Every structure is written in structure tokens, then in C-alpha cells.
Amino acid sequence: TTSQWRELDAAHHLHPFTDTASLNQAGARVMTRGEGVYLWDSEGNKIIDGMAGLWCVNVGYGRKDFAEAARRQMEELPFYNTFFKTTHPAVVELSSLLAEVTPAGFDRVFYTNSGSESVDTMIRMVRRYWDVQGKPEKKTLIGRWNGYHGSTIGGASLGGMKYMHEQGDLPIPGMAHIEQPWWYKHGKDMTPDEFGVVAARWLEEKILEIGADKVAAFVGEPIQGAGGVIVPPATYWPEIERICRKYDVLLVADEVICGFGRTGEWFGHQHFGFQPDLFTAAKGLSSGYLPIGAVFVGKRVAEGLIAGGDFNHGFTYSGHPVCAAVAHANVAALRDEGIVQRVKDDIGPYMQKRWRETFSRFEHVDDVRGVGMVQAFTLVKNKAKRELFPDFGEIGTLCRDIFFRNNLIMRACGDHIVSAPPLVMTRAEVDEMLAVAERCLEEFEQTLKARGL
Amino acid sequence: TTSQWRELDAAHHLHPFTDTASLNQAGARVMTRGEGVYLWDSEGNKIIDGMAGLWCVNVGYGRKDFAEAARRQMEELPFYNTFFKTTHPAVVELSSLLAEVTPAGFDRVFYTNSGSESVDTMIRMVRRYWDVQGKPEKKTLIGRWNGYHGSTIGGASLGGMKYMHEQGDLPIPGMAHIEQPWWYKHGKDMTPDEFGVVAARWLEEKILEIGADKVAAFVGEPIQGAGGVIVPPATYWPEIERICRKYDVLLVADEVICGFGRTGEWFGHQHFGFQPDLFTAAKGLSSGYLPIGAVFVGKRVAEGLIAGGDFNHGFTYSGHPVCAAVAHANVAALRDEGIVQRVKDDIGPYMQKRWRETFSRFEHVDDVRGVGMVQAFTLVKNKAKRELFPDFGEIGTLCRDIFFRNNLIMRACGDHIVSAPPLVMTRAEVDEMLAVAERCLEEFEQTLKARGL
Ligand SMILES: Cc1ncc(COP(=O)(O)O)c(CN)c1O
Ligand SMILES: Cc1ncc(COP(=O)(O)O)c(CN)c1O
Secondary structure, X not given: OHHHHHHXXXXXXXXXXXXXXXXXXXXXXEEEEEEEOEEEEOOOOEEEEOOHHHXXXXXXXXXXXXXXXXXXXXXXXXXXXXXXXXXXXXXXXXXXXXXXXXXXXOOEEEEEOOHHHHHHHHHHHHHHHHHHOOOOOOOEEEEXXXXXXXXXXXXXXXXXXXXXXXXXXXXXXXXXXXXXXXHHHHOOOOOHHHHHHHHHHHHHHHHHHHOXXXXXXXXXXXXXXXXXXXXXXXXXXXXXXXXXXXXXXXXXXXXXXXXXXOOOOOOHHHHHXXXXXXXXXXXXXXXXXXXXXXXXXXXXXXXXXXXXXXXXXXXXXXXXXXXXXXXXXXXXXXXXXXXXXXXXXXXXXXXXXXHHHHHOOOOOEEEEEEEOOEEEEEEOOEOOOOEOOOOOOHHHHHHHHHHHHOOEEOEEEOOEEEEOOOOOOOHHHHHHHXXXXXXXXXXXXXXXXXXXX | OHHHHHHHHHHHEEOOOEEHHHHHHHOOEEEEEEEEOEEEEOOOOEEXXXXXXXXXXXXXXXOXXXXXXXXXXXXXXXXXXXXXXXXXXXXXXHHHHHHHHOOOOOOEEEEEOOHHHHHHHHHHHHHXXXXXXXXXOOOEEEEEOOOOOOOOHHHHHHOOOHHHHOOOOOXXXXXXXXXXXXXXXXXXXXOHHHHHHHHHHHHHHHHHHXXXXXXXXXXXXXXXXXXXXXXXXXXXXXXXXXXXXXXXXXXXXEOOOOOOOOOOOOOHHHHHOOOOOEEEEOHHHOOOXXXXXXXXXXXXXXHHHHHOOEEOOOOOOOOOHHHHHHHHHHHHHHHHOOHHHHHHHHHHHHHHHHHHHHHOOOOOEEEEEEEOOEEEEEEEEEOOOOEEOOOOOHHHHHHHHHHHHOOEEOEEEOOEEEEOOOOOOOHHHHHHHHHHHHHHHHHHHHXXXXXXX
């Protein structure tokens, strides 16, 4: 029963990013089944999954073909390691397919179990690369305040969430942070395009404050996900790239979210028009059907790692055959069923138009934004004056609770509301989701006013 | 073909703990199928897997029931996150079953994708614990030289492999290391039991040097795996535990290898008779059939973490439903099919007797050792003098290459040779494996002499 599952969960399970005592007193929501864009819970609610699991179930729920690929691989060879001068066909075939869907010059992939492990891999690869170049001082990686790069000690350090830094005595050494390109807060009297150049040049100013000979890499999500779908101006990434090339700093895209079609390009960096030296992946790589991540290593960094002999790094389940077989089915479906192309040409433009049509009218909604199948808005105290609520996050929590009670999953990141539904969502699904979201915002506005805004 | 698979692997795949240029020149061995204790490669060789994948395929290859459990869960609900005050039946049922097979006082489990992530989780938990206790200086974790705790930045820093420290600028702060309890090298004129007390007192020396008020935890593998199946004396772990309790230091077992039956007990700390405050797991948790790890949190540390409110840590695939369903089937089989009990009562004692009967006679083999279904020996230049070969690892590589050419997988850790076969191996299989190993060592002794070493 719901009761028994909640009691066992409270007794035995510690959840990610959770206040355990609060969750155990409230009761966990038990999700039992998924099909297309929908979920069911243990109380029989049918739920619109406007978050695709956690930005990751890109082909939607219910792929029986993926379950068959897993079953077949698991019966033949459930596991073999890639440590003993050994490989297996599933990881070879996935590596070959991944070279076809990635840009030219990304031939070589290193596998992990998660986006967090891909980020730690990338940190060790970047530092190893500069050692092989004979630059042992070039070790600092620069991230952003409100960037998210996972939950390993490495990834939490590179990320810019102070609430994670405060648990574990982070960041570790050789990590620095610049402000995020959040125009609504930091744009002063500028247009987004003017601001994009200013926000990019924060990187150059930080490189010069530290010393360029000490800086290994700049790492960024093309769009900041957990930070609230912070979509940088069009001028931002070309300027970041120019600054990285000027100082001989590696450029790293964290594609764990934007990867595998979320923007309508295969990768977020293709949408924003920059060319990273390496990029990190997970999530959409297998649509979340099994845990797998990757680091895609460009030609320059690959040659440096190869010139360095032993790379003393990796995970038991790196290249796991069952995970590789499911990822292969998933990437083959994204390409061969035209799912990525449909985001670029059809459902992305429709979602973006309908999202702006739906939210733009609300008194306490501003900065309506998105690309492809990631979109967001911010809850604001005064739209005219672009004033935010104090205690950023309290009002976002009120709004997300209304969504959840109405069987719609959209997440609050502070007072940002975000959505990243399965890429296969139909136009009709998009309209159904926006109709429920619109009713939830009307209730939100009524509640604000009733309670004294 | 073998040729086509090797060419694609060389072009596209970066392997864990590998010299890529050397592997791509040699050609990777392509493993295609597994059954019981055996593997087949792309050239049709049948191979005895004396390493159970990578110390992890505890129930052996060919569990069609596990593939069915994976298929069924993947069709129903392939993924849902445990972040949104959400849970799902598979992770609840696994959490309940794990409380039944773990010692009393380990009710609460935190899920990861890997042993490395479990170690990073444990480091952030132990630091968070001491913050909640109001001891914010108590942050240093102590490990051992030649200890292995994974390949995240955190796990590589806590581990004691200098060849990992040198790639990534590790260890991170708040990490210290003591010498390993390796009697053959460090025991001088002591008995093993005398040496166990001296080697444990190295921990006391390190605590007093740092200051107990700055030390959060001591972390150790019950038996050092990747370091070469370093089996400590019987006096070691009781003395470690006495020292940790004296100085108010948490005691952490890394059970990633010893866990899930490898010693004949469910966990290595039960064999060696110490009670850790937390322990890390992966590998045998799912017999490697899908990626999953865990941190088992004892009552005292669990209460501290719960009293701390939000724990700002976790992974997208934490508690992954498909991985949890397979882990559940695996743990149920270990208990209900009597597999762990059989290691303790039957196959463990048989292996340990036959291992000692097989190797003890060879002129350049010494320190023949093991417990349950993990066993090892050291290749030595002169047994009388306990003189090791120079360039520790070169002679182990020669010996491992003979095994691999004879379709037997045993791993070299420097000049240690180690074995950890599936726990379901039959007595007959054990004799088959030992007969091949014996012939390989005869060849090894002939090759040593032929080459003047
Ligand atoms: C941009 C980014 N990078 C890294 C990670 C970490 O991935 P994982 O949770 O699979 O460890 C995430 C997870 N949301 C992410 O969004
Ligand atoms: C004791 C120990 N701890 C942690 C790890 C890391 O586990 P993983 O490779 O699954 O990240 C290993 C891996 N062999 C290990 O042997």
C-alpha cells in the first residue's frame, strides 16, 4: 500500500538533496509506472512529467525495445571490465555510434556511471593534459556561481552552489568562480547582447587576477539547468571562446542536460556556437533507462592524454555492457526516429511559441525564456520594476507545491520555474501541459494576492 | 571480426587505468559471452574468470532471472528520481532487504552508481556529521599507502596510490595516510600478531601528529584488494578500532570488494571482528549485473545527518529502479540460495586449503594467503631473505601474461598475484583453475631461470 511503502522508505532510505526528517514526517510520493510523457503514483494519480525524470528521459517512458536490448545483453555478457587490456562488443559499438552523432574531432570517449563521475574524470583529464604539456602550474578550473556540475567532491567544488560548498569543506584547491550571465539580475542598463560581452569578460578579468599560467580550463553548462534555466545572451559563448583561446585555457561544455537533443541540436554548445575541447554527458545518453555517462575528448586533449602513457583513472562499471547496449538503442532512436531533428524543426519552435503565449500575461511572471525543449520563467514581486521576492526560493516553493497537487511536475530553482519534458512530447501533449500550468499560475496569483503579495 | 572490433576500439574508446597508445598497438582482447565461471573471447577461447569480472560477479555469469527482473522493471518504470520528495517501489524493497542482511544498527542506506561515488558520499557524510556535532575542525580522513578507495577526486585522494595522486594534484586537503599492514615487507623480526599491533599503532602516531580534534575518520578495506590482497594480522583491526574509539574518530570499512560474501561473512569487517560507524559498498551488491553502490550508515552517524536538515548531495541515478530490482534479485539469491553460507562452510575452506597446497611449493612464490574466496601470493626473488624483485610489477606482468595466454584470468598487483572468482565456483572448477595456474607457474619458473632472474 502507499502507507507501507512510505513507512519502509522513512525507515531505510536516505534521499539525494533532501531534508530526511521533513520528508519522513510528510510521506514520500511513490511513483510506480511511466508511459510516454506520463507517470502514475501509488494513489492512481496520472501525472504530466514536465521534467522527463530529471532532465533525462528524452525518448519518454515505455520503450520496450530498450528493455529487450538490456535483457539480451544481460543474458549474453552482463559485465566485463575494460581495465585488463579488454573490451566487449557493446562498448565498441556504442563508441563507434557516438563518433557519428558528435561533431568532427570527437572520436574518443571515456565512460563513467554518472554526470558527476564524468565531471571528476574531466577535472583529472584537464590537469593531466597540462602536466603532459610541461605546465604543472596550469591547474585551476573556473566555474560560475549558480553553475551545477554534479555532487562528487570535484563536481560540487566546480559547481557554484554555496549550499553544497558548506557540506564537505569545498571547494577543493584550484577551483575559482565568476558570476553567472543572469541578465534579469545583473544586466544593469544594458541590452542582453551588451550584457553577454560584459558577463563573458568576467572570465578574462578572473584569469588575469589569478594569472593565465595558473588557469587550466573554464567549464560551463551551455544553459544553467539546476540554477534555473539561465539562458545566456547570444554574445556570451563566442566571447567566452575568444577569451579561452587568447589565454590558452581549455573550454569545457557540461552537456549533462543540454546533451542528446534538448536544445534541438545534438549538444547545447552547437546551438550557442562554441567549440569545446571536451564535454561531459550523462542523462539523455541513455534517456535515464540505465546509469551511464561519458567524457567526449577532442583531438588536442586526446593526443595529450595518449602522449602521457597510463591514465590512472576509471570506474569498475565504466563501459558496462548492459548500459552501453541501452545507450546504443537510445542514441540510434534519437537519430533514426528523427527525434532530435523534430525538436529543431517542429516541437521546439511550437513549445517556445506556446510557452511565451501562455506565461507572458501573468503579473508576477517575467523573463519567459527557453530554446528547443528547455524553458522557464521567474516569479517576481514587481514585473514593471523587475524586482525579485526576498528569500529567493520561498515563492518558488509555493508555486511548485500547486503544480504537484495538480499532477504536473515542473521544478522550482529558487523562484525560477523550469520545464524539460520528454523530447517526443506531441503538440497536443504540449498544449495539455500548458493548460494545467496556466491554471496553476492563476491559483498562484490568487494565493499571492489573498495572502498579501 | 576480431580485427574490426580492435580497430573501432582503438579509434573510439579510452579505457580505465590504461596506457592507450600501448593497448592500441597490442590490440584489445574482446570478451563476447559469459557462463558460470567462464568467458569466451572473439577468437573462441574459453577462459576461466578467476577475477569474477573485477572482484564483483559474485553469483557468476548467465543469470537469466536477473535479466528478466531488469526487463520487467525497465518496461514498468525505467527511471524516476528520489530528489522531489519522491520514491519508487524497487528502491524501497531493496532498502528493506539490505537492512535484513546487514548487521544490527545499519537500517539506513544512501544509494550511488559506483564504489567511487559511495566513497565521495561517505567523505561528505563524515564531514557533515562532525559539523552537526559542532566540531567543524574534525575534517581529516586517514587512509593507507596502497589502499584503494576508487577513482573520484575524493576517493583517489583517500586511496594511497601515488600513481593516482600524481594525476589531478591529489590528495585534496584533510587527507592523511599511514603505512599498510604488509608483514612480508615491514614485519622485520616480529611475528604477524606482534606486527599487527605495531601497524595499527601507526594510526595512533598519525592522530597524535595531526591532533585528534582535527581527525574525522579512519577508512580502510578489511583486506586491501587492488593493493594485492594484503590480509592484515588478526591483531590489526581490533587495535585500529581501540585507537579510533580512544580519540573519538569514526571507523569506516570500505566493503566495495569484501562485501556481499567474499570472505564467507556478508562483510569483511564481520570476519575481522570490528564494528564500523559506516561502510561503502558496490560490486557484489548487484554482482556487477548493473551499476549500483551504497553507503550503509550506522545509527549514531544517521541520527547526526538527519539532525542536520538538508543533505545537499546525491546523483541523478541514485536508487535507479532497474539497478535496484537487479540488486534485490542478487541479494535475495546470495541469501536464499545459500551462496554466502556456502563460502563460509564449504567452498571457502576448500579454496584456502587447495590454494596453499598448490602454490606453497614454488621457489619464487611466498606469502600464500587468503580468506573465503579471495586469495593471493607474492612473486619473490629469494624466499629465505624475503627479497622482492626490483622494479616491483615487472615480474608480476610477466606472470600475468602467461596466465592470459593460457586462458586464465588472475591479476597482478605489482608482483602480487590475486584471485577472486565467482562465489558459486564448484570444488571441481577450483581444481580446474588451480591445475591451469600450477602449469602457468611451472612455465614462469622456467622463464625466470631462462632469462637469468
Ligand atoms: C550540468 C550537470 N552536470 C553534472 C550533473 C551530475 O550528473 P549525475 O547526477 O548523473 O551525477 C548534473 C545533474 N543534474 C547536471 O545537471
Ligand atoms: C575497495 C574499493 N573501494 C572503491 C572502489 C571503487 O568502486 P568503483 O570502481 O565502482 O567506482 C573499488 C574499485 N575496485 C574498490 O576496490
